[PDB]
Symmetry: C4
Subunit: 391 residues, 4 copies
């Protein structure tokens, strides 16, 4: 909406204060020419406290740096201007909460970690500048040298060209080596873990298929069977992106699970002429008991002569029904067609054999659900009965 433009501009003015307060604390020559662009961001902070633990909010909303820089206080009390950086925690939380609705959150956390370490490095460089003795050197060169030393120490590379001389600089260097190096290492570890977490679904698919292929290679499986299995896993990845629905649907509660199920399987519902145009109630019952199954090319979906429980609804593919000895081709079933009603409209062993002419996605309704649905709503069975006899 327009809250996001406000939260982005709060982010912009707090990055402004993070970049500006240490620079002015180092060089007091500023705060004179940057004042016109200042003041307005302080009003922004003081006006963002109504426009929303809020303890950092009320502490950072205080116009404290204005008076500190105006009165030219010495360092013990000049270091108090940095109370305007406590807005960083609140703005980080707000950005994480708001911007996660559209973009991958792991990426957003990675960006937040990068920004935090960069800001900390800039602040440490500014702190290192002050402890240096006063020398007639350009400000740009001085800041470049300080930032170079800060990145060298924080990355645990330590070339050794810039080293502390005074005991004050030595204590500061010790503190930096103890804290900033460890924090940087921890943030790098979190960034590495977050990089790994970017594609957890693809990693789960890869680890499953890798375990299966390792077993198959150990068991001296024939190459004909190595294919038909690796290709099946590849098709699984392609079409379904390794998200097994059963596992992820379980987390949601039943009211929302229903909505998710109808939105997902609405494609199958609309196509099957038996499902579509039927009452909403039947479809609600059906939508949770439809089980996707994947059959490879030239694979036997149903054989002639098993007890026969399940009924299969074709979603995307084509199958063929053959005789008990695979000599009469009967009829070719296709997308939107369904087979398996005779076994249960009557009570006989499987009538014929069903083979897949190609890669096919089939929805399988279980025996228990079929018996319940044929009992509770007969209108549905009526369509089946004309279909069963004709068949």
């Amino acid at each position: 909406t327009y809250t996001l433009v406000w939260k982005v501009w709060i982010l912009a003015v707090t990055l402004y204060y993070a970049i500006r307060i240490p620079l002015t604390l180092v060089f007091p020559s500023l705060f004179s020419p940057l004042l016109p662009l200042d003041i307005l961001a302080s009003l922004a902070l003081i006006a963002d406290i109504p426009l929303d633990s809020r303890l950092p909010d009320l502490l950072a909303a205080l116009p404290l740096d204005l008076l500190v820089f105006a009165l030219h206080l010495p360092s013990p009390l000049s270091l108090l201007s940095l109370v305007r950086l406590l807005k960083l925690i609140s703005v980080q939380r707000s950005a994480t909460r708001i911007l996660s609705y559209r973009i991958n959150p792991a990426l957003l956390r990675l960006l937040s970690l990068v920004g935090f370490i960069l800001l900390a490095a800039h602040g440490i460089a500014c702190g290192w500048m002050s402890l240096q003795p006063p020398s007639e050197n350009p400000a740009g060169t001085r800041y470049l040298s300080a930032f170079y030393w800060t990145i060298t120490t924080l990355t645990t590379i330590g070339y050794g060209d810039i080293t502390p001389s005074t005991p004050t600089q030595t204590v500061y260097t010790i503190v930096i080596e103890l804290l900033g190096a460890a924090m940087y290492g921890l943030v790098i570890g979190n960034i590495a873990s977050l990089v790994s977490k970017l594609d957890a679904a693809k990693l789960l698919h890869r680890e499953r298929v890798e375990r299966v292929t390792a077993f198959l290679s150990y068991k001296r499986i024939s190459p004909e069977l190595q294919r038909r299995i690796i290709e099946y896993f590849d098709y699984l990845w392609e079409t379904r992106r390794g998200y097994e629905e059963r596992e992820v649907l379980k987390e949601l509660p039943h009211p929302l699970r229903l909505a998710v199920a109808m939105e997902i399987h609405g494609d199958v519902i609309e196509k099957v002429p038996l499902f579509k145009g039927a009452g909403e109630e039947f479809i609600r019952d059906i939508i949770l008991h439809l089980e996707p199954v994947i059959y490879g090319p030239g694979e036997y979906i149903i054989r002639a002569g098993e007890m026969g429980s399940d009924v299969y609804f074709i979603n995307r593919g084509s199958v063929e029904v053959l005789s008990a000895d695979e000599k009469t081709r009967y009829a070719i079933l296709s997308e939107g067609q369904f087979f398996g009603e005779m076994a249960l409209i009557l009570r006989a062993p499987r009538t014929a054999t069903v083979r897949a002419r190609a890669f096919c996605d089939l929805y399988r309704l279980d025996k228990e659900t079929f018996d319940r649905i044929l009992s509770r709503y007969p209108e549905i069975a009526a369509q089946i009965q004309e279909l069963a006899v004709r068949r």
Copy 2:
């Protein structure tokens, strides 16, 4: 109690000896002015051995450093004063055991790791001081330089300004680089892992909701359904802090599980006028079979015309009961009210539809428990029967 003041003072006097023994081993000018504040801590160690593997206890309780420093022994036997630092392991174990009753233990382990690495750095700096040639330099500056070198080596930064000169210093430096650097890296890794472990419950909530949202975004779920789901996960986090009770209650044994269950669900027990004032026995039976369920705003808790098993007790929220065609508003049920008895006092399909006027927390008693409770204790059913007919 007062054991904690004793265990804290043992910690204080053992940190005193960890900080003091190397300093006196380096500078023998001490142990003359720090003796009055000494001696009493040695009595403390010798009096703590009755006041409690205890092998470090009995070895560190020995007044060994007194005689070593009094006789001015040379280094081969002067290094034996450090047997008073074996109390560190025992005091660390005791602190971990005792202070975990009130504070997060992960934080306590983090503090212990920080203290151990700091103490090791101080000791290594003191050891590095002795190997240096005798120079007319201030003790403070010498210790600062040694500590600076120790932190530089241990952090694998290696500026290079302070380097070994004698072969003895070279061997010491090699040993430090081999051991202290690796130990520091391992302790930093443990500290990082412990920082991550500080909020495992919030990480579990985040990983669950992230997986669900990734699935939903992949499946092209409509924004109307993206909300109602993200908000539900947010309410779940808010109210219940992502602790699913079923998972955590399982670990406890049944005797203690009962006490936990009554203390948790006592709020529901006291409110429901049917539950409260009833015999303790009924409530004990009920307290384990009450299943919390969360229904979103404007959601259908019960529909008119399913077989109807469960009975729902309202804990915090409001629901409405409507006609089969949602045209008569009947009665508005509220906090402390319960619905669903007619389906099972009689044996009919669901009488009416129940919708949620707002976000509601409902306790659901299963069909099996309801039948058992209505059989074993009839007094409870009596209240239901007047309620069922009136309804």
Copy 3:
């Protein structure tokens, strides 16, 4: 087939361009003598775009470096020749997809990571060469010094002998320390994890046996029982390489599970004279319900006087059947033999005791499957009946 020779030659010409473009960008003295061996690889790129997100493909297929090097453009536009390295991502994906059919993929990923970091180091060294002031030095020595500096910075070792002097070199060094060091650390972590993942099956066996042995050592198990258990785990590892079939077979769908099961247990099927030569249908039913079990030497497979459910088919080993008091040796059963039919052809308690004369692998058919198979196909029972009475 011959696609692999093409994909390998695409890999060869893209490693050629990764190694060549920065070298020519540094030294413009090239591209004159390497032109004859060039041009043909550019035709290879332009001819590989029909011979197959493909956005890197179409961008890298453009003959952009030819015109850049021919017109002698200055650096702002000379840096555009590096658009021929976007083929690296596509060739990496293609190599990972194609070469995984024959070699362990973890090893292939390790090789890819090593190649990527080596190529990045070469590129960074070439970039560092350009920023140096023009000096009358040999090209080989200059490149060696630059590569030495690049490996020093990227490995976070930082000797300090080669350091930036100009502010341009300082900014480049800062960027390298920030990016390349972190990327190198992350790639090293991935390589370590991949090294660990090379033998996940052997790690799972080791962790299972380690947990069991820890429990046994805690419970003060006698050494006679420590052996018979560690040896059994060792035999398990030897023969079956710690791949429990039940766990890995579950992942595959039923059509492919059948093929895997027959190819695996075909050894048992062919040997048993009862199984072999029987109809394909019986064998299909049987092949999924045959449960491998491992019995140690001198171990009681069946005792005389339990109800008796299961029937065991000997696969590799020898067992002995003794009297109820272990005094008559009856008959010695061997490889390919089976026992346990009397208990269920009749309905009696176990007739005799079966002990293992040596380490034996037995296939156990469950009670439920045996009753079903004896009902559905009688021909099989006929062979059993002559066998049962004679026994």
Copy 4:
């Protein structure tokens, strides 16, 4: 046995060759005075090839270094003496296989990793010595400087005092920084993981109790209930060391599971006068269905008036049986006693209430097992019947 003295002496002579071959390759002044102690270890290698992939065995068994050092070959062919270090892999595998029978294996792997990195550091130092220009310096000082440089580079500390000068030394330094630093980091990571794995049982106990305590603290559990739960977890840790038997027993097969179960629960079997002296068969049936349960002090094991299924056998503790209103103390049951037979010898609701006077360990036989055992073997019931009536 005596194989271990042989495998230890193979380890000793292969560490001898790992330490000696590079030293002689650097200084050719050796191999003259160390020859008497040599030769015998070469016979040891040539005699260990009968006394046992074995490819490293047959390659390292070849007396190759003798001829290389005797003929004074130049470096290209002098580097071939290092084929006697391929025995390291085979000896490492043999040590890991053999010494794991008595000591924690994680510790053994830690020692192996430490030895491997130390040996690699020594070898790299020896290699760095040769590339140096010939200088009139003591061998001890030269080796100390080389080892100092090797540890500095491998630990990524890089002081900078010892740096390559010739391009040959620069290439060697680059290779060392690329390989040895990464290998050292990976070995340090493995050592850290192994240190963590040393006490996995205590970590599992700690993580379980920590999760439970976090839940309890969140739910505002009263301090009376915080105790009785933390103390129960502490007693669990004390007595059973957090090894839940059910989880670890599952891994073992049934033949070995029986032996483990009888050796563990033999204490309970011998004590109960009903169990002990009974036939081995009954005890075999019982030994798997005895379920340990832990009841806290002053806790209600059985209440008067539930249906009553289970029978409890006291193992270590004391319980009291009271009236329905806790006014008559009846009899005090103790260690070795059992209660709960009346509920099932007759068919009545629980006769009286059983409370624990102290912390008690109870074995609980389930209802199904009790009915089966009372049917199959009546002799056992006979003892129960006199006991039931008297009670």
